[PDB]
Short mmCIF file of C-alpha atoms and ligand atoms in Angstrom, two decimals:
data_model
loop_
_atom_site.label_atom_id
_atom_site.label_comp_id
_atom_site.label_asym_id
_atom_site.label_seq_id
_atom_site.Cartn_x
_atom_site.Cartn_y
_atom_site.Cartn_z
CA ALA L 1 77.91 107.74 114.86
CA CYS L 2 81.64 108.96 114.68
CA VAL L 3 81.30 109.36 110.84
CA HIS L 4 83.39 112.14 109.06
CA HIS L 5 81.10 114.84 107.51
CA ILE L 6 81.94 116.79 104.31
CA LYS L 7 80.19 120.13 103.39
CA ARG L 8 78.08 119.92 100.16
CA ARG L 9 80.05 122.99 98.85
CA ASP L 10 83.32 120.90 98.90
CA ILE L 11 81.80 118.29 96.45
CA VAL L 12 81.44 118.97 92.73
CA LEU L 13 79.74 116.12 90.83
CA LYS L 14 81.38 115.69 87.36
CA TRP L 15 79.40 112.83 85.74
CA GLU L 16 77.84 109.41 86.50
CA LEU L 17 79.90 106.12 86.55
CA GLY L 18 77.23 103.59 87.65
CA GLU L 19 73.55 103.09 88.58
CA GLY L 20 72.00 100.51 90.97
CA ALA L 21 68.34 100.49 92.25
CA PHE L 22 69.23 101.90 95.76
CA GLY L 23 72.11 104.26 94.63
CA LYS L 24 73.84 106.20 91.76
CA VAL L 25 77.69 106.71 91.63
CA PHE L 26 79.43 109.87 90.31
CA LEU L 27 82.94 111.07 89.71
CA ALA L 28 83.31 114.28 91.73
CA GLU L 29 86.08 116.76 92.69
CA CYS L 30 86.37 117.02 96.52
CA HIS L 31 88.05 120.06 98.20
CA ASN L 32 89.92 120.24 101.59
CA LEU L 33 89.64 116.47 102.01
CA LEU L 34 93.38 115.98 102.20
CA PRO L 35 96.07 118.57 103.03
CA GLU L 36 98.47 116.69 100.62
CA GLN L 37 95.98 117.71 97.81
CA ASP L 38 93.78 120.90 98.15
CA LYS L 39 91.57 119.27 95.44
CA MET L 40 91.26 115.50 94.47
CA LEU L 41 88.93 113.05 92.63
CA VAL L 42 86.47 110.75 94.47
CA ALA L 43 83.48 108.53 93.73
CA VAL L 44 80.26 109.64 95.38
CA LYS L 45 77.26 107.31 95.97
CA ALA L 46 73.91 109.14 96.09
CA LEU L 47 71.09 107.43 97.98
CA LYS L 48 67.94 106.76 95.83
CA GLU L 49 64.89 106.40 98.28
CA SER L 50 64.39 102.69 106.33
CA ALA L 51 66.73 103.97 103.48
CA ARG L 52 68.33 106.70 105.78
CA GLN L 53 68.80 104.03 108.58
CA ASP L 54 70.54 101.65 106.07
CA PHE L 55 72.74 104.61 104.99
CA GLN L 56 73.55 105.42 108.68
CA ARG L 57 74.38 101.65 109.28
CA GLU L 58 76.52 101.48 106.07
CA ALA L 59 78.46 104.69 107.01
CA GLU L 60 79.01 103.59 110.71
CA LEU L 61 80.29 100.17 109.41
CA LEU L 62 82.57 101.74 106.73
CA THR L 63 83.99 104.20 109.32
CA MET L 64 84.88 101.06 111.43
CA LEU L 65 86.47 99.08 108.48
CA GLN L 66 89.73 100.84 107.51
CA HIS L 67 92.73 98.93 106.00
CA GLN L 68 95.20 98.97 102.98
CA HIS L 69 92.84 96.50 101.10
CA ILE L 70 89.28 97.62 102.07
CA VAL L 71 87.67 100.34 99.88
CA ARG L 72 88.55 103.73 101.46
CA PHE L 73 85.54 105.65 102.89
CA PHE L 74 86.05 109.43 103.42
CA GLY L 75 82.57 110.14 104.97
CA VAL L 76 79.03 111.45 104.25
CA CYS L 77 77.34 114.65 103.13
CA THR L 78 74.02 114.81 105.17
CA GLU L 79 73.37 118.51 104.25
CA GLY L 80 70.35 118.23 101.86
CA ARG L 81 69.13 115.23 99.80
CA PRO L 82 70.68 113.57 97.99
CA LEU L 83 72.59 112.08 101.01
CA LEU L 84 76.14 111.15 99.72
CA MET L 85 78.81 108.63 100.76
CA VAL L 86 82.28 109.65 99.46
CA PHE L 87 84.83 106.97 98.43
CA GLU L 88 88.33 106.73 96.97
CA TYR L 89 88.29 106.73 93.13
CA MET L 90 89.69 103.41 91.81
CA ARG L 91 91.02 104.16 88.30
CA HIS L 92 90.73 100.55 86.88
CA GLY L 93 87.23 99.96 88.35
CA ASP L 94 86.03 96.48 89.34
CA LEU L 95 88.46 93.56 89.34
CA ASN L 96 86.16 91.44 87.17
CA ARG L 97 86.28 94.02 84.27
CA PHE L 98 89.99 94.49 84.91
CA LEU L 99 90.61 90.69 84.64
CA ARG L 100 88.44 90.27 81.51
CA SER L 101 90.26 93.18 79.78
CA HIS L 102 93.75 91.68 80.53
CA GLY L 103 92.76 88.08 79.56
CA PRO L 104 93.38 86.05 76.33
CA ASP L 105 89.75 86.85 75.08
CA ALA L 106 90.14 90.73 75.45
CA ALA L 107 96.66 96.51 75.49
CA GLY L 108 99.66 97.51 77.78
CA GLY L 109 99.23 100.89 79.61
CA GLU L 110 100.70 102.64 82.67
CA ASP L 111 100.22 99.98 85.47
CA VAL L 112 100.27 96.77 83.31
CA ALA L 113 102.05 95.06 80.38
CA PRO L 114 100.12 94.20 77.19
CA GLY L 115 98.57 90.70 77.02
CA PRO L 116 97.63 88.25 79.77
CA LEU L 117 98.67 89.33 83.25
CA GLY L 118 101.69 87.36 84.48
CA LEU L 119 101.53 84.72 87.19
CA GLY L 120 103.24 87.23 89.53
CA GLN L 121 100.65 89.88 88.64
CA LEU L 122 97.83 87.39 89.45
CA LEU L 123 99.40 86.34 92.80
CA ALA L 124 99.75 90.05 93.78
CA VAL L 125 96.01 90.58 93.13
CA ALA L 126 95.05 87.33 95.02
CA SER L 127 97.40 88.30 97.89
CA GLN L 128 95.81 91.75 98.29
CA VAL L 129 92.22 90.33 98.36
CA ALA L 130 93.31 87.71 100.92
CA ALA L 131 94.98 90.54 102.96
CA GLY L 132 91.57 92.26 102.93
CA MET L 133 89.73 89.09 104.10
CA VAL L 134 92.20 88.56 107.04
CA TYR L 135 91.27 92.05 108.25
CA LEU L 136 87.51 91.22 108.06
CA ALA L 137 87.87 87.76 109.76
CA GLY L 138 90.08 89.62 112.27
CA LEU L 139 86.86 91.64 113.14
CA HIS L 140 84.70 88.44 112.86
CA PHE L 141 82.85 90.28 110.02
CA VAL L 142 81.14 87.92 107.49
CA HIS L 143 81.18 89.40 103.93
CA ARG L 144 78.53 87.01 102.33
CA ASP L 145 79.25 88.27 98.64
CA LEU L 146 83.02 88.05 98.06
CA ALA L 147 83.60 88.02 94.24
CA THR L 148 85.86 90.01 91.79
CA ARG L 149 82.84 92.21 90.91
CA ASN L 150 83.02 93.46 94.54
CA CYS L 151 86.71 94.47 94.45
CA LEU L 152 88.17 97.62 92.84
CA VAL L 153 91.62 98.20 91.32
CA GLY L 154 93.39 101.54 91.80
CA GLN L 155 96.52 103.10 90.31
CA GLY L 156 99.51 100.74 90.80
CA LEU L 157 97.13 97.72 90.73
CA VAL L 158 96.15 98.37 94.37
CA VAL L 159 93.14 96.03 94.90
CA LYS L 160 90.51 96.68 97.59
CA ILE L 161 87.37 94.84 98.79
CA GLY L 162 83.89 96.42 98.85
CA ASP L 163 80.26 95.17 98.68
CA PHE L 164 78.30 97.18 96.00
CA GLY L 165 74.45 97.15 95.59
CA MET L 166 75.04 98.10 91.87
CA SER L 167 76.62 94.55 91.54
CA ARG L 168 73.04 93.02 91.68
CA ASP L 169 72.16 95.16 88.58
CA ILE L 170 75.42 95.30 86.57
CA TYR L 171 76.09 91.55 87.31
CA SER L 172 72.55 90.19 87.89
CA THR L 173 73.54 86.97 86.08
CA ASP L 174 75.92 86.23 89.03
CA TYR L 175 72.85 86.08 91.35
CA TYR L 176 69.99 83.54 91.70
CA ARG L 177 66.81 85.62 92.43
CA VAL L 178 64.83 83.56 95.01
CA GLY L 179 61.16 84.35 95.85
CA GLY L 180 61.45 87.87 94.31
CA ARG L 181 63.30 90.12 96.90
CA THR L 182 66.51 88.12 97.73
CA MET L 183 69.59 87.55 95.51
CA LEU L 184 72.00 84.64 96.11
CA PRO L 185 75.54 84.47 94.66
CA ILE L 186 75.09 80.67 94.42
CA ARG L 187 78.23 80.14 92.24
CA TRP L 188 80.40 81.63 95.09
CA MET L 189 78.56 79.98 98.11
CA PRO L 190 79.63 76.63 99.79
CA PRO L 191 77.12 73.75 100.34
CA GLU L 192 76.34 74.77 103.96
CA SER L 193 75.36 78.26 102.66
CA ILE L 194 73.03 76.86 99.87
CA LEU L 195 71.67 73.89 101.96
CA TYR L 196 71.50 75.26 105.57
CA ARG L 197 71.70 79.09 104.95
CA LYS L 198 74.71 79.44 107.36
CA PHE L 199 77.23 82.23 106.59
CA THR L 200 80.59 82.19 108.38
CA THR L 201 84.21 83.20 108.07
CA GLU L 202 84.50 79.68 106.59
CA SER L 203 81.78 80.35 103.94
CA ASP L 204 83.99 83.47 103.08
CA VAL L 205 87.21 81.37 102.61
CA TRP L 206 85.11 79.14 100.27
CA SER L 207 84.18 82.39 98.36
CA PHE L 208 87.83 83.48 98.41
CA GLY L 209 88.61 80.05 96.88
CA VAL L 210 86.26 80.89 93.96
CA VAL L 211 87.79 84.41 93.75
CA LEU L 212 91.18 82.69 93.27
CA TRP L 213 89.61 80.71 90.36
CA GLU L 214 88.15 83.96 88.82
CA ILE L 215 91.63 85.57 88.95
CA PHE L 216 93.31 82.58 87.26
CA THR L 217 90.51 82.31 84.62
CA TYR L 218 90.73 86.15 83.97
CA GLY L 219 87.22 86.69 85.35
CA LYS L 220 85.13 83.85 83.82
CA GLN L 221 81.89 83.04 85.68
CA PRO L 222 82.37 79.89 87.84
CA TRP L 223 80.22 77.08 86.33
CA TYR L 224 79.52 79.36 83.33
CA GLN L 225 78.44 76.16 81.44
CA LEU L 226 75.62 75.59 84.09
CA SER L 227 72.15 77.10 84.80
CA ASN L 228 71.56 78.37 88.36
CA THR L 229 69.75 75.04 89.26
CA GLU L 230 72.56 72.96 87.58
CA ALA L 231 75.18 74.96 89.64
CA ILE L 232 73.25 74.34 92.89
CA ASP L 233 73.03 70.55 92.12
CA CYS L 234 76.70 70.40 91.22
CA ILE L 235 77.87 72.42 94.31
CA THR L 236 75.69 70.42 96.76
CA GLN L 237 76.85 67.10 95.07
CA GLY L 238 80.46 68.13 96.04
CA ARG L 239 81.60 68.65 92.40
CA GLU L 240 84.80 70.94 92.38
CA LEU L 241 85.84 73.66 89.83
CA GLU L 242 88.54 72.56 87.28
CA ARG L 243 92.14 73.95 87.49
CA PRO L 244 92.34 76.87 85.00
CA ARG L 245 95.12 76.61 82.33
CA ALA L 246 97.00 79.63 83.90
CA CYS L 247 96.86 78.01 87.44
CA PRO L 248 100.01 76.15 88.67
CA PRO L 249 99.19 72.99 90.70
CA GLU L 250 100.57 74.79 93.84
CA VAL L 251 97.90 77.57 93.59
CA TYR L 252 95.19 74.98 92.70
CA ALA L 253 96.05 73.39 96.11
CA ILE L 254 95.28 76.68 97.99
CA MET L 255 91.91 76.72 96.16
CA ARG L 256 91.31 73.11 97.35
CA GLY L 257 92.29 74.30 100.87
CA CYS L 258 89.19 76.64 100.67
CA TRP L 259 86.82 73.96 99.18
CA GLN L 260 87.07 71.18 101.92
CA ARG L 261 83.44 69.99 102.23
CA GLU L 262 83.61 70.35 106.07
CA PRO L 263 83.73 74.08 107.09
CA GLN L 264 86.34 73.23 109.79
CA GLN L 265 88.68 71.32 107.39
CA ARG L 266 89.11 74.58 105.31
CA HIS L 267 92.47 76.41 105.70
CA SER L 268 92.13 79.71 107.63
CA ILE L 269 92.37 82.91 105.47
CA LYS L 270 95.53 83.93 107.44
CA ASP L 271 97.14 80.64 106.17
CA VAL L 272 95.97 81.27 102.57
CA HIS L 273 97.16 84.97 102.59
CA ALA L 274 100.54 83.69 103.89
CA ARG L 275 100.75 81.01 101.16
CA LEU L 276 99.78 83.63 98.45
CA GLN L 277 101.92 86.57 99.69
CA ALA L 278 104.97 84.21 99.82
CA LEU L 279 104.47 83.18 96.13
CA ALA L 280 103.82 86.78 94.89
CA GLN L 281 107.13 87.93 96.54
CA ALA L 282 109.08 84.77 95.36
CA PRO L 283 111.83 85.49 92.80
CA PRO L 284 111.06 85.01 89.08
CA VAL L 285 113.49 82.01 88.91
CA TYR L 286 111.19 80.18 91.38
CA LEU L 287 107.92 81.35 89.68
CA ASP L 288 109.09 80.62 86.03
CA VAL L 289 109.30 76.96 87.13
CA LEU L 290 105.94 76.74 88.97
C1 OQS G 301 85.91 103.79 90.09
O1 OQS G 301 86.00 103.98 91.49
C2 OQS G 301 84.94 103.59 92.26
C3 OQS G 301 83.83 102.99 91.66
C4 OQS G 301 82.74 102.62 92.43
C5 OQS G 301 82.76 102.80 93.80
N1 OQS G 301 81.67 102.33 94.59
N2 OQS G 301 80.43 102.10 94.00
C6 OQS G 301 79.60 101.70 94.93
C7 OQS G 301 80.28 101.59 96.16
C8 OQS G 301 79.92 101.20 97.47
O2 OQS G 301 78.83 100.82 97.86
N3 OQS G 301 80.97 101.25 98.39
C9 OQS G 301 80.65 100.90 99.78
C10 OQS G 301 80.92 99.46 100.09
O3 OQS G 301 81.70 98.80 99.42
N4 OQS G 301 80.26 99.00 101.17
C11 OQS G 301 80.47 97.84 101.96
C12 OQS G 301 81.73 97.30 102.12
C13 OQS G 301 81.90 96.17 102.88
C14 OQS G 301 83.26 95.59 102.98
F1 OQS G 301 83.47 94.68 102.06
F2 OQS G 301 84.20 96.50 102.90
F3 OQS G 301 83.48 94.98 104.07
C15 OQS G 301 80.83 95.54 103.46
C16 OQS G 301 79.57 96.07 103.33
C17 OQS G 301 79.39 97.21 102.58
CL1 OQS G 301 77.79 97.86 102.39
C18 OQS G 301 82.21 101.69 98.03
N5 OQS G 301 82.57 102.05 96.84
C19 OQS G 301 81.58 102.00 95.91
C20 OQS G 301 83.85 103.43 94.40
C21 OQS G 301 84.94 103.84 93.62
#
């Protein structure tokens, strides 16, 4: 348990940002956290209710996972309930909201032009999320719920991967509630995950595949035209998501790389990150003709 601790007195809650059923999130000022900044803004998750153990496991895990494109964890405040986890504040919030609000069905601020994000803007986002997934597959860590609702966008369109309990509330429609405890992101899962309940690196590249589709559809729900049971039938019957208008055939091919029926046929995430980075850093003259 080599988790950083922060004194309660160094955390000033400002207001709420989000509610789940296991946690509340707050904007807070945090003091003496960085020398660069004597004071600075963070998001703080307060535990609602076993629960303490889950909190200790979450904190140990998030102290392990550090990387440019994983949500930055600063540490815990264990001095009095509510127990707090302290996170970097991501000014644009979740990538799904960010996509929807820069999509044809939505103006231009500080980090972004008005109107649809450009192809180069969408490859940059896809690249960063892939960079994140490399680092997790690196550690042989299976995510199990990769989707735009579980990434955050910071100042400068820095995109980072998380896994938020509040996602099951805010975005319940993205989950199939089985039995009455469990919640399955069926629209993001490959056939082996739905059929055999196996979760692997390779079930995560499938999910990354669908993230790529979300990016290029500006955050539409995959199979939005289908019920949860229709999506299951269609995913088990091998039916593949259509190329979005904004998706060049060359990007659609990376998606197909992630959707090979056979887990082992799927391109590695390293390969995909490489394909996507290369495009995002390609000169406009090359991209304007893709
Ligand atoms: C506006 O700025 C905001 C807004 C919201 C937030 N915010 N809200 C909730 C959470 C939260 O739970 N975490 C921890 C987390 O993501 N945990 C995790 C990560 C992984 C892995 F994907 F990294 F691998 C796996 C498993 C778990 Cl449990 C972080 N930030 C949250 C933060 C800033």
